[PDB]
Amino acid sequence: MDKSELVQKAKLAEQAERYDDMAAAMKAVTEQGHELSNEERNLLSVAYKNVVGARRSSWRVISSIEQKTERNEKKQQMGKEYREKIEAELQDICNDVLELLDKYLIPNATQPESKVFYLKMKGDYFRYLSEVASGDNKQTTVSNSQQAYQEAFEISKKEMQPTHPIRLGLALNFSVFYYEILNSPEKACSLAKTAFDEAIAELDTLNEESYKDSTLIMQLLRDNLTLWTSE
Amino acid sequence: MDKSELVQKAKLAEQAERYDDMAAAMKAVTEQGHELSNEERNLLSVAYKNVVGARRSSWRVISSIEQKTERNEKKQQMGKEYREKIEAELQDICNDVLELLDKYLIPNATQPESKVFYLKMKGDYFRYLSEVASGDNKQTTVSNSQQAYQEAFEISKKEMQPTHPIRLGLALNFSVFYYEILNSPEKACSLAKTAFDEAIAELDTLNEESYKDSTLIMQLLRDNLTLWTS
Amino acid sequence: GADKALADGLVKRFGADAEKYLGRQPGGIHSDAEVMALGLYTGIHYADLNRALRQGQELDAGQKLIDQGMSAAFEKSGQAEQVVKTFRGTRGGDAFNAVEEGKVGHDDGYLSTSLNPGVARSFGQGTISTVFGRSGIDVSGISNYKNAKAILYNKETDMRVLLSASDEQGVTRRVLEEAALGELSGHSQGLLDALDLASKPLRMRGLDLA
Ligand SMILES: O=C(O)CCc1nc2sc3c(c2c(=O)[nH]1)CCC3
């Protein structure tokens, strides 16, 4: 199939909320070895956000039930198995999407805006792996999440505006990586403060294309900061 | 696989909203050839309601776009193909369901409450087939939907209370079958009126706490009626 | 005729002070009465005029012409083509102080804003606002002291507070949007969704009631 045909099916599958077909269409478009247009990049990212996100919810649900239901050697084994079936899928969704980043998306990306977007996205899918990962494997997926975020962060500081929705978006997910995964609210806040402080200082750097986009992400930062620093 | 293990996975998959696994678990429980308990019957019915319903939405969604964007012959062809891919899925879910009804569910069901519930369901999944079906095949799926509903309806009148949530439930879907599928509002309102006016006439027997289940379904019937007479 | 009456009025009551702005927009979307009023305003009258409008007192004979002359200009103009990022700073409080984030409100006087982020600072470090609009008039053609390059928004022109936040310096930093640009405006198509941000976003049982 043609690049345009796959993107039409990918746009179609989204409305139908058939995010599994939407993901397969965009995976094929990516495997063509060409740098994705802003629309293509957005279609790929929402498809996998939804596919992976669906199992992240199901996982948290079953993990919640695993703890609430604790009496039978068999009933608990039924839960462990179902939790493990969902972990298996999460790992495979993250593997397809992380392999797309390494093989095509990150190497082919030439503009800084895109090179940051995909490097932020690399940390995101490693963070999802970290949530379910255990011991030595968790150590590996946490190390990789921090590295991908940090690499994107240095690039966002050099080649990007403090009010860019991409720079702000990375700053919100990395601060959430420290607070949730590394369980360091001190590290979490420190990052969220800087990202916000730099943005409030240069609101003259807002884009007329994405101003409402930036204020939204800026609110989310300012909210987590005041929530994490409240007793 | 143990009957209890499958039902535990089926209950688990529901909370996780993994209705495809929830459907597979209950399909296996049904294929054991034993009459399903009220809980098992309800778990099977919601699993497939959700699986089939998901493609019914996706189908209506693509179909709306199909006619609104007849601009390009290739972009339109993308539409036709995707509509047809979903029609395939719809047909296969309704085939899975109706095969379970014919082979196990309807033959094995012994109480009247059971034999009406499944015969109403047989009508529902034929109606879903009718929505996407074309010509000679549509004629067949409409004929089968009406027959399954009518068979259940005669049984519901003989062996059931006019206020039973199952009898009211069938009356709800059959009147919707006439209005949507056969496009006869006259036939639809006639059925909905009778089912309601028989239920208002004999509600004086409040089923202790079950007079919330029936009142809800009675509303949906009364509400469709007042909407159709526009 | 009506424009001639208002033009005749502004000169009869302001002389050369008004007459000095005649023919400053040789393009000419606006009338002579409209160009003059805007210039008289942009120059020095923005002080007293917005003082009277905000305080809700009776306008004087001269003020009244500058006002009706500016209103005339905002009609003719209307919603332009592209969104305009302009900045406006105040010494202390702004009328948008009571407007809660997300909700809308307006400054009872005209809203003079600049294209320069530096000349907006020049007017105060109490509140520093960034304004995105489309129904603003570029009076930079008529008056342009300190190279203000002003873009004026109408009196009682409704604005949505998109972000109101404070500096470690104390200065409250706001972002206002012209209400009439909508909800849809200001976003890059599905960017927010693709960013996959780390933040949170009637039947009973099995009977398939349809
Ligand atoms: O009385 C007023 O209009 C509020 C104070 C104030 N005035 C002005 S005028 C002007 C600007 C400005 C301002 O920021 N505050 C910048 C563009 C030219």
Numbering used by the authors:
A (entry chain A): 3 to 233
B (entry chain B): 3 to 232
C (entry chain C): 232 to 432, 445 to 453
Cite, word for word, the article reporting this structure:
The ADP-ribosyltransferase activity of ExoS and ExoT and their cellular toxicity are dependent upon association of the ART domains with 14-3-3 proteins.
A protein complex with an apparent molecular weight of roughly 83.5 kDa (indicative of a heterotrimer: an ExoSE379A,E381A monomer bound to a 14-3-3β dimer; expected molecular weight 83246 Da) readily crystallized under various conditions. We obtained crystals in space group C2 that diffracted to 3.22 Å and contained one heterotrimer in the asymmetric unit. The 14-3-3β complexes of ExoS and ExoT looked very similar overall, and the STO1101-bound ART domains alone (C chains) aligned with a root mean square deviation of 0.97 Å.31Fig. Our crystal structures revealed an extensive interface between 14-3-3 and the ExoS and ExoT ART domains. This site involves the C-terminal α-helices-8 and -9 of 14-3-3β, and can be sub-divided into two parts: (i) The two proteins bury a common hydrophobic core made up of side chains originating from the 14-3-3β C-terminal helices and the central β-sheet of ExoS/T (primarily strands β4, β7, and β8). In all our protein complex structures, the phosphoprotein-binding site of the exotoxin bound 14-3-3β protomer was occupied by an amphipathic peptide containing the LDLA-box in a short α-helical segment (ExoS residues 420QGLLDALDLAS430) in which the D427 side chain hydrogen bonded with the 14-3-3β Y127 and Y130 side chains, and the hydrophobic side chains formed hydrophobic interactions within the amphipathic groove of 14-3-3β. In one of our crystal structures of the 14-3-3β:ExoS heterotrimer, the residues connecting LDLA-box-1 and -2, E433-D442, could not be modeled; but we found unambiguous electron density placing LDLA-box 2 in the phosphoprotein-binding site of the second 14-3-3β protomer.
